[PDB]
Amino acid sequence: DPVYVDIDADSAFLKALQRAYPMFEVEPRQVTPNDHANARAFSHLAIKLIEQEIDPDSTILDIGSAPARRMMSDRKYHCVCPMRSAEDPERLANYARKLASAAGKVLDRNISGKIGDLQAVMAVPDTETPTFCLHTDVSCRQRADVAIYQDVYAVHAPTSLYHQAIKGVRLAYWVGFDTTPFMYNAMAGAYPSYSTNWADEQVLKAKNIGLCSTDLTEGRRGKLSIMRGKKLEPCDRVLFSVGSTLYPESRKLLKSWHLPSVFHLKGKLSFTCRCDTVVSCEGYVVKRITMSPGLYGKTTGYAVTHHADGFLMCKTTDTVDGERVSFSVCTYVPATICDQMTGILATEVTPEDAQKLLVGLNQRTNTMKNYMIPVVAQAFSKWAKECRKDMEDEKLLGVRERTWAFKKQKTHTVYKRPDTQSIQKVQAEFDSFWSSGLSIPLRTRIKWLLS
Amino acid sequence: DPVYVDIDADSAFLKALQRAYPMFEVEPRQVTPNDHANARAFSHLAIKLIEQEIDPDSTILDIGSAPARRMMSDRKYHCVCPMRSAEDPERLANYARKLASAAGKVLDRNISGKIGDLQAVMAVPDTETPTFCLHTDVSCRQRADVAIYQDVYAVHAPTSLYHQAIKGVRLAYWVGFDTTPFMYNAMAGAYPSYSTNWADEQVLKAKNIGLCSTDLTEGRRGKLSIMRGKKLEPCDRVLFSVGSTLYPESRKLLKSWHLPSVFHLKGKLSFTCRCDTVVSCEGYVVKRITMSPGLYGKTTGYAVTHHADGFLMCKTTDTVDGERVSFSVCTYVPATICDQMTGILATEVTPEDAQKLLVGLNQRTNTMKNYMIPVVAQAFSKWAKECRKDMEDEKLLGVRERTWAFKKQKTHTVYKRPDTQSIQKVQAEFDSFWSSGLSIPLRTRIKWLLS
Amino acid sequence: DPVYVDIDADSAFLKALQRAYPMFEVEPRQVTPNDHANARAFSHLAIKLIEQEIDPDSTILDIGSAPARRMMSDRKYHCVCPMRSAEDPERLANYARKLASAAGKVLDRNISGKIGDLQAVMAVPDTETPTFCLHTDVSCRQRADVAIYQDVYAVHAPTSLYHQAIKGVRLAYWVGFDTTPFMYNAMAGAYPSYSTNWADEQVLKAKNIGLCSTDLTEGRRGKLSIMRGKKLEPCDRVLFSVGSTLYPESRKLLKSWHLPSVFHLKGKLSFTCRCDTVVSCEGYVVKRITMSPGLYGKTTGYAVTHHADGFLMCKTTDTVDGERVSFSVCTYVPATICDQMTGILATEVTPEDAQKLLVGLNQRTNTMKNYMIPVVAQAFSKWAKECRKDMEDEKLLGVRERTWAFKKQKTHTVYKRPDTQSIQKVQAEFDSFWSSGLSIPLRTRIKWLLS
Ligand SMILES: C[n+]1cn([C@@H]2O[C@H](COP(=O)(O)OP(=O)(O)OP(=O)(O)O)[C@@H](O)[C@H]2O)c2nc(N)[nH]c(=O)c21
Ligand SMILES: C[n+]1cn([C@@H]2O[C@H](COP(=O)(O)OP(=O)(O)OP(=O)(O)O)[C@@H](O)[C@H]2O)c2nc(N)[nH]c(=O)c21
Ligand SMILES: C[n+]1cn([C@@H]2O[C@H](COP(=O)(O)OP(=O)(O)OP(=O)(O)O)[C@@H](O)[C@H]2O)c2nc(N)[nH]c(=O)c21
Ligand SMILES: Nc1ncnc2c1ncn2[C@@H]1O[C@H](CSCC[C@H](N)C(=O)O)[C@@H](O)[C@H]1O
Ligand SMILES: Nc1ncnc2c1ncn2[C@@H]1O[C@H](CSCC[C@H](N)C(=O)O)[C@@H](O)[C@H]1O
Ligand SMILES: Nc1ncnc2c1ncn2[C@@H]1O[C@H](CSCC[C@H](N)C(=O)O)[C@@H](O)[C@H]1O
């Protein structure tokens, strides 16, 4: 009846968890000092909900699985495991160890069958078994009706979904960090409730952002090099830090999962699909996708995000490896603070006065993490100013003055308040869509572990 | 005896719901975190009331139905389902699944007959059954006495009503968002109690409205393009966001449902009709229409709206894709705030002082959503000013000075106070009024689901 | 069920210990006045956790052991003991004494076997026994599955790990002081919670750092020596003081244990490895390393540190042997103090006012040790100033001005706030990897002690 999560009983994240999963009874039971506890707790509850939603005797494809996390479940999982990351062999060895440990003490689960399939696959690397295989997403041959993607950021979404659809899958789920900041094309950012920071590779030698390192210096004027940098814009490669765990990512693949409300997959067979967000908690989301044969209706190409807390994007000035530059940074702000700043932002306010007001509101325990307070205070200060200028240059209704050129105004802050929506135009019609990789020493090690 | 709605027990919308449905006992019972909960609750109670109002052994046509929502009812529904939207196939599959799940556990409803009709229709796409068919509103052949339209915005109202009338229907209902803002021809707007925002397609790159997105820039003066925009007025296509769900709409079809108090349908057969509003709650309404054979009385062509809370329309200045422009926006204001601003608006007040007074009245929990407070403060400030000028240029009774031209004055705010009425002139006499579309893969899928 | 540590019942370090080991019940029981009690307590709890984590019937290699600390354990240890430090013979004699004392009173442990192996090794210095040998890390011949390094700072990490891996070891642990300050290349520093200070050999005659000594003088202007010092930068040799115990160290070997998240060992056999931090307490850490045969994935070469309290590096001015100079110093600051200085650092503050505010916050018992307060007050004062200048010289978005030279700015303070991360680039692919030393008088002494 109750669900247990490994967090401190005094934490303030438990209230947000209980608000996001009202159909469960959430109890804290802390056993480790893990520095990314909140993310693990959210993922655990998400899988509980998804299992509650679907029916038994249905076969489930787990794309890019970590098998040891599915071993005590009663449903029917087929784990797809290619070996492409440096962390995979340790996960496989953990699976074998946990299988061997519990082999005559637990008899409610297909333990003997799981062991048999693991040994069979170790014998011949190119066979499909009910519970385990060694292919990718586009070369597995098992047929199923449901697919699950959990923290998978390394595939192009439409191609992968088409290859699941032609095999009979009608329903899919995706669990992960919200993709909205990468649609606005920010240079660096934070997910403060989850102790997570991310940055573009070009700014890792900055000074005052969440993820960076630099040195002391006295400052020399020469630095004479004939190269022309002259231009600093975002590039493909990005670095993520979740607590103290590091992961590299690609902007193109992250953007590909920011799907519109309805879309068409037009291949040899054809499908009509829709995508909607069913859980949203302070930057972490769950998405549900359904797919149907044939072509119906028409598409517009728009994707919408609903903001329950505030979302901010702003321009900032820093030194990178000693040289002063400007670039854009993004973050999330709790709704109670946003509501309490409404009156103050009616006038022009300096950054230093906004900082003191925010500190006054925060400290009572803290509602929001202190290291982001300065950059927020700057952004609010600019936003207010840009509103006043708008009211002081009033235009005539229904008319654009384009004397034959028109001027563009400055914009240094974007601020989405609680209960507003972002909307962006993306592609909505798609028509353009194996070697073993295992080694004998690892096979011998796994065989030895099982026996 | 009590009705259950999926909302939080602490919400302030429950008081308004209880006020709008005094004949029921409304109890909150929350099971999901749905971000458009209030709209779903209002629709559920509306259907309960309509069923209470009419008598059994009457056959009901459900136009543009979602059949799974009618499956546990005891009345006799005929669901009209063409397949014209990208969301329809998923709704059909949900219907088949829910039918198969409950087939020997529920015996108070025509479950076996419903399954039989679904299979019969899948066999031959061009047959009418008691419970289900695949035609449009103007090509269904079933005869009935009542018709229901629930959240249907895609048909021209007089043509549809005439085609129901010539089949013997004498009573119809319509449930939906209030059409008044589109009669005033606003560019964008909000329904704040339902977490809903809407906008014209031409202003989706604005900065400070409910539904928009834009970018950071430094501002270049060139932007040299020889096109002459020169003119910015509303056009047909509009976008709606209900929580995080997106829907496109057409202005012409929305205006067509803003019907006068009495009207005539003059075809081969003739009818006399009247329309009145029976439920009104913070922007959501229920309308009741009766139709009778023959021609009686005379028409004027006026349609009236009664305001229980305040309604505002005003001019605002923003930047769209970097360029500064002006346009009109509309919203609703709670009656207690309107009553508490009566004394302050007797003098000239600046926008910045009005904003601080409104914040003082709001925060005690919030009576009204904070993101609309600035634009309201501006509107009130203009309205007061325009009243003072009127009192300072007094005319003579019963005389128009038209020396031979007359001048028109500025008008930047329209404000309808609680207990006033809007009135508009519209048309009141009308005299000017099929392929399958299903696919074999979907038919096979549905057949498989039923078995 | 409870674990006992030799600390005062009134100490404030017990709360931090209980926070870092939530799976235990920690009770204070003081028996000695030891001036490095906190470090010993942390090491004791770390070994308890590691033993809890792994399974029995596994053989454990203890690299650079002190055997008397393993004698009352139930697991199977093989202690590797070369004789390379001046403290080793006393540890060996203590082992022999404690073995002889308990030889018929304790029968749950392999006491008789331990004595037999000690005598056998004393007889022939070049034999391996289950419990004891006299080789180094790269010349021991025993085969095992787990390795442990406890307070070992004298080996090059990749070479040592490769030599364990080719013998079948799959899992290793490392316990020690955090290596982050030596990656930033500081000249001197402190670990204040553990009563520990360290310094470069060139600054041991300073005046106001943690570890130093100097003299009184009147000051003569001559000091004429023709040598050109002219340049003061860190060199390899460093001195550590833990309470009143002194240890010399090498910068190269300390840096070698600051390992990236994944790496490859490419020799005659090949391995893929990953490293992560599982316990972190105010400057003391535990690291866990896993190794697998074969080559999988790809590497980036980045190492990340997560900051739960604040970390500071700053420039300071002192006199060394009478001559005034400047150099860099580093330290740790508790999170509550950092959070309480957020509002004050929005403006420019002098060092003398920051010192008085910090004293006000500290004294209530002390949260932080007083001897570091002046140097912290200076650092904060500089950091604030450098932030203001950044906001006063704003650049254009996306552009570097390199008119053809660019200027570098001054940087006198680096400040990592709670919940941020450091990231550094290090090597991630490695492909480049005995005499007795005992004496007859010592052998005779040990033989006499055993009998
Ligand atoms: C695989 N993966 C996981 N995460 C997140 O980072 C956290 C670490 O995920 P993990 O896979 O490193 O956790 P592990 O299986 O080692 O078990 P644990 O250490 O006991 O939790 C997870 O909680 C995820 O939310 C991830 N985040 C990003 N950006 N990219 C990834 O590939 C990725
Ligand atoms: C079909 N439709 C529904 N709405 C409103 O938008 C909401 C979403 O309606 P929905 O049909 O998307 O809800 P669904 O059937 O998926 O079930 P739910 O997600 O569990 O509620 C409804 O509550 C309606 O009030 C709609 N609003 C507009 N503007 N246009 C539409 O066509 C339309
Ligand atoms: C062997 N060693 C130990 N330490 C730390 O310094 C402390 C003294 O370690 P110790 O080995 O001198 O303690 P001893 O075995 O004499 O027993 P005790 O005096 O009763 O505790 C330990 O608690 C370690 O944390 C050490 N610190 C450094 N820098 N270098 C070392 O080689 C080293
Ligand atoms: N094309 C592909 N098809 C299937 N899996 C892939 C893939 N490309 C990468 N992967 C796998 O995706 C995994 C992501 S990390 C593992 C995430 C896992 N589901 C969890 O919950 O912890 C990696 O193990 C990697 O091997
Ligand atoms: N001309 C027409 N006649 C009947 N239905 C139509 C129609 N044009 C569109 N529709 C249908 O109207 C529906 C509107 S969305 C479905 C609303 C449904 N009554 C509910 O309560 O959820 C779509 O399914 C669409 O297929
Ligand atoms: N190459 C090497 N291989 C194994 N041990 C070594 C070594 N070089 C130095 N050592 C040993 O490492 C020890 C470090 S001091 C002893 C630390 C001990 N593990 C404890 O907990 O107290 C010294 O005794 C020294 O003899």
Ligand SMILES: [Mg+2]
């Ligand atoms: Mg981990």
Ligand SMILES: [Mg+2]
């Ligand atoms: Mg929905």
Ligand SMILES: [Mg+2]
């Ligand atoms: Mg000692």
Ligand SMILES: [Zn+2]
């Ligand atoms: Zn497979």
Ligand SMILES: [Zn+2]
């Ligand atoms: Zn019909």
Ligand SMILES: [Zn+2]
């Ligand atoms: Zn040995």
